[PDB]
Amino acid sequence: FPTLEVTDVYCEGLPKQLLWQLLGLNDLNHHLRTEVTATELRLRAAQDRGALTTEAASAAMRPFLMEFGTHGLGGRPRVVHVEISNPTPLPASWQLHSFDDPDGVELENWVEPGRPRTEGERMRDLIAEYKLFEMRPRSGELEPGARCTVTIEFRPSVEGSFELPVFLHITDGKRLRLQLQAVTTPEPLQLLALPPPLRTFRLEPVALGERAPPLQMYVLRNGGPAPLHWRLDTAPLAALAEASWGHPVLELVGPEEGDIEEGGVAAINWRFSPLEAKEYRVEVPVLLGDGGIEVIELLGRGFAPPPAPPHGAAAVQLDDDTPAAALDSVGGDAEAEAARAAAAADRDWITWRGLSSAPSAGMAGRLALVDHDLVSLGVTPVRGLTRRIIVLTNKSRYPLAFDWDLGCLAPPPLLPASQLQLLAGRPLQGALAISPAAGSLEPGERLVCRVSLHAGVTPQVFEGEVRCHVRIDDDAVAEAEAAAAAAAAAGAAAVAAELPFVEQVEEVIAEAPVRGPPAPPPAVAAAQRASRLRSRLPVHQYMTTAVRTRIEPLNAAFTATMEARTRRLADATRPPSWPEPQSISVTLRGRILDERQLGALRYVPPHERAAARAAVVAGAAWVPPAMVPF
């Protein structure tokens, strides 16, 4: 069956993992990949002969939520670039259809849809009226392996909520409904980033007797409205501890409260220390500045590790990563691997088949490209210095200033081995650095940037986001213009050398007869006449003085046309270049693991178990020793 796949999605100032999670593209890719499509045949039959209706189709088609969240009124519209490709060899023709929207039918003196009298259809009609939700390509067709680069944009100009259902409608294949859900708040009301995978955070299963449970990072984003003041009530966790014979479980490490700026990132570290193999469902509230719940459920399980051998009989040291045997070896429990797979689908973007971890969409209009987005730092030892390289390319013909920022990944004001206590209270428990902090870059120049992580003593799993800000280099462009001006001055000096002391009349004092400008040569006069006759005012719009005096509205129209023609010059004269500074972002995920955990492969994902075993058996990660204090 000719199907489609979403390879990647690009949006301004939002992590690619977060965008994929918010759109729920895992389920979309799965459904578009495999389905018998029993009822879709009936759906196509009803689409034929015009039997289908939007409401019934939505009720029977199991819509998928395209969540755009909340947008402050008057804020910048949000754009979503989705790359659609054909995994199947058969060429795929697809037609985004929605019966409310026009279906390629010519309207001639047909009254627009009347007063709906039902607020759902009314909201649909306001969306249609004010172009709130628009997908540019509409219907398309793709050869096997092609990329369509579809764009869907939302315009936060109206107040209130808006839900618009459209459906993909592949010509021969499945037809899935997407419900674009957004709310535009005229007033600032904090709403934390609340994707369904983040609401129920699937904690990675951990060893029952682990000496130091791995810190697990949870990232909160403000969203559209004003900055969010969050406070997490530890009382349910305290109740859990009291129930668990007074042992700390699901402990919060960071601050209990905080103030995320608009479109910001705040990281909270959890320690999951279990006592049983049972599920540990714990529900915690999030009190915002204004009244709110935003409750978060944490789920984890017990690893039930193989019994630790006595020192006498220990496995000597000097199994395949891919198979499910690896998952079973990482946790003998039947449901431990199920929880691990759920957590992988929740957070590990690599395991998702569709995602490409490439710049993909957004080729046009982006100042620069990171060659490889969504970069994963490998599993690292306790005090490990792990490096990766990311190359940035300037597509713009203009020089670009490149600055590097860390949202929650900032180093404390690499790290000295003795004085690692500075890492206390820091979400990463490591020091991220990039070799170019801020560098200029010429057009078409590719720069290598080394991202290096120096980890601390606390085992951790980080999935952070690092921002790179690209702006047009005003200094460089001004220098170029100044060089051009200097060249022009040199040319003027050369012309002066050619013609010594050309006279220029400084001023005029009482020239008794009025003297006009010198007459041009007749050829130049003819050329100027032809130039004037070009851009001649249109015949039907030129009102003579007599007609203007006779008819006032014609005089007003003539004045308006003069004003319009004067205005037309200003837009041309304005230099349309210098686009807005653009912030790109790359997600980095890594596993700071203890030596015992690495040796036993306790928490390495199956995707990287081969690399973990390599790093254990043969030293593959550096451990900067520095100098001992004593």
Partner: protein, 77 residues
């Protein structure tokens, strides 16, 4: 209607009237009018619809006129 019909026809009228050089227009009209003047001065009389279309062919002036094609109309639909 404006964009589909009137904007198109005026845009095609322009870049043709604009393309026509003023000097060429003056020379063309001058050749025509001097041909008419010469036939008026030589021949005893001038008649419409009676010309020999050999010495003086006024319809060549109408032939040398800007022609603009047609596209589509929204109002008539």
């Amino acid at each position: 209607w404006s964009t589909q019909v009137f904007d198109t026809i005026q845009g095609r009228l322009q870049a043709a009237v604009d393309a026509r050089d003023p000097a060429a227009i003056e020379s063309r009209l001058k050749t025509q009018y001097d041909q008419y003047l010469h036939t008026t001065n030589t021949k005893v009389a001038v008649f419409r619809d009676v010309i020999i279309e050999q010495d003086y062919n006024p319809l060549a002036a109408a032939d040398a006129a800007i022609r603009v094609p047609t596209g589509d109309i929204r109002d008539p639909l």
